[PDB]
Amino acid sequence: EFKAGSAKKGATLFKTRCLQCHTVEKGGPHKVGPNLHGIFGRHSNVLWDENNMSEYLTNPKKYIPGTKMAFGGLKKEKDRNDLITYLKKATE
Numbered sequence: 001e002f003k004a005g006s007a008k009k010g011a012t013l014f015k016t017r018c019l020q021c022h023t024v025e026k027g028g029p030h031k032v033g034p035n036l037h038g039i040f041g042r043h044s045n046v047l048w049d050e051n052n053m054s055e056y057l058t059n060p061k062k063y064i065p066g067t068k069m070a071f072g073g074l075k076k077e078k079d080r081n082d083l084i085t086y087l088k089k090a091t092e
């Protein structure tokens with residue numbers, strides 16, 4: 001169900017909802033979460049592709065309720081396709 005979307009809107013969604021814990025650049029520093037470079041091909045066993053990550057990123061995960069250490073989810077379909085379109089181009 002993933003359809004190539006907007007990398008522009010995806011890049012904005014990354015700085016707002018992912019950058020806080022993750023980095024995309026080659027040889028990026030491990031932050032609260034791992035470096036997502038080369039994520040599409042890598043596993044944990046979960047062979048990362050666009051559709052299985054769209055499912056993964058749909059649900060929010062509160063690590064420390066009360067602080068900004070929590071992922072907010074991507075409940076809108078457009079937002080997931082946008083973020084993945086960006087992320088796919090930026091993690092290689």
Ligand code: HEC
Pocket residue numbers: 013014017018019020021022032033034036039042043044053057063068069070071072083087
């Ligand atoms: C901190 C509050 C996080 C935010 C915001 C996002 N992620 Fe996350 N992510 C985080 C941690 C602590 C972990 C480790 C494993 C766990 O489930 O706890 C992850 C892991 C990922 C992964 C898996 C990477 C891998 O197994 O190599 C992906 C693909 C991932 N996170 C993507 C991702 C995206 C796209 C986010 C924003 C939309 C995002 N994460 C935010 C912590 C946090």
